[PDB]
């Protein structure tokens, strides 16, 4: 199937409580595989998935050098952004960055990404052409000019189309037993009376991987979008995910309702009903 790799960086200032914390995490699809935390007793890149443990000491040293240097770069960046927005030295601020590559079912590059936010607001992003930037405001225009001067976009494009794709393909092969295994949802429909004349029908999906799933309720074959209560997909902690969708139905009308489940691990999409 389709796969992606992403690195997620968070740098957070904390005036009066030491220097800003820098944390980086790396993911292949919904599986985290590495972390670096500048607050750790001994900051080092650490494995977070069993299939990355086979990487050599050169890999871990290379990651750690990059992340240790980024801790410093991001502390300078937080000082710079505070200046660009004329902010006081008193408040806590956050820079987030996410970048990586997407591959399609043939393993070919679909597109690259690089996006940054300041205090949870879009700040600067590399355009889909991997050659130009979109700056949100006059502060981000300063960053845009610096990055043009250092020829950042050219270096980032070469990484996104090269190393990023090559390492993602290596991880997908090393981790094929889990990363390329889609686990279908285990499903069931529960019934809970709400009153003498209404009841809740809840459609469950448990134990699935990846997180992407479609769970909907239909009444006489028509989608019940506005009347469906749909919980955010949640992690079970064993790599798998969980989700439910619920509808409040008039008593005696339960068989007019069907729950539809679409997921990559299923041999066929499911049509479920309440089974008393």
């Amino acid at each position: 199937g389709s796969h992606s790799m992403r690195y997620f960086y968070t740098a957070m200032s904390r005036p009066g409580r030491g220097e800003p914390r820098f944390i980086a995490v790396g993911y292949v699809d919904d599986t985290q595989f590495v972390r670096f935390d500048s607050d750790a007793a001994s900051p080092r890149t650490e494995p977070r998935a069993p299939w990355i443990e086979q990487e050599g000491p050169e890999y871990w040293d290379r990651n750690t050098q990059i992340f240790k240097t980024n801790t410093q770069t991001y502390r300078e960046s937080l000082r710079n952004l505070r200046g660009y927005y004329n902010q006081s030295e008193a408040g806590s601020h956050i820079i987030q960055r996410m970048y990586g590559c997407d591959l399609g079912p043939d393993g070919r590059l679909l597109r690259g990404h690089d996006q940054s936010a300041y205090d949870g607001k879009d700040y600067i992003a590399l355009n889909e052409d991997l050659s130009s930037w979109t700056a949100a405001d006059t502060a981000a225009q300063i960053t845009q000019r610096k990055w043009e001067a250092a020829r950042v976009a050219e270096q980032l494009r070469a990484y996104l189309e090269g190393l990023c794709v090559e390492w993602l393909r290596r991880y997908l092969e090393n981790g094929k037993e889990t990363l390329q295994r889609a686990d279908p949802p285990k499903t069931h429909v529960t019934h809970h009376p709400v009153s003498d004349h209404e009841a809740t029908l809840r459609c469950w999906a448990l134990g699935f991987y990846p997180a992407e799933i479609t769970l909907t309720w239909q009444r006489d074959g028509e989608d019940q979008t506005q009347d469906t209560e749909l919980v955010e997909t949640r992690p079970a902690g064993d790599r798998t995910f969980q989700k439910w969708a619920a509808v409040v139905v008039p008593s005696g009308e339960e068989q007019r309702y069907t729950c539809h489940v679409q997921h990559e691990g299923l041999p066929k999409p499911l049509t479920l009903r309440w089974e008393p």
Partner: peptide, 9 residues
């Protein structure tokens, strides 16, 4: 593997 080029904002 992460991107190795350092560039401050």
């Amino acid at each position: 593997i992460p991107f190795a080029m350092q560039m401050a904002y």
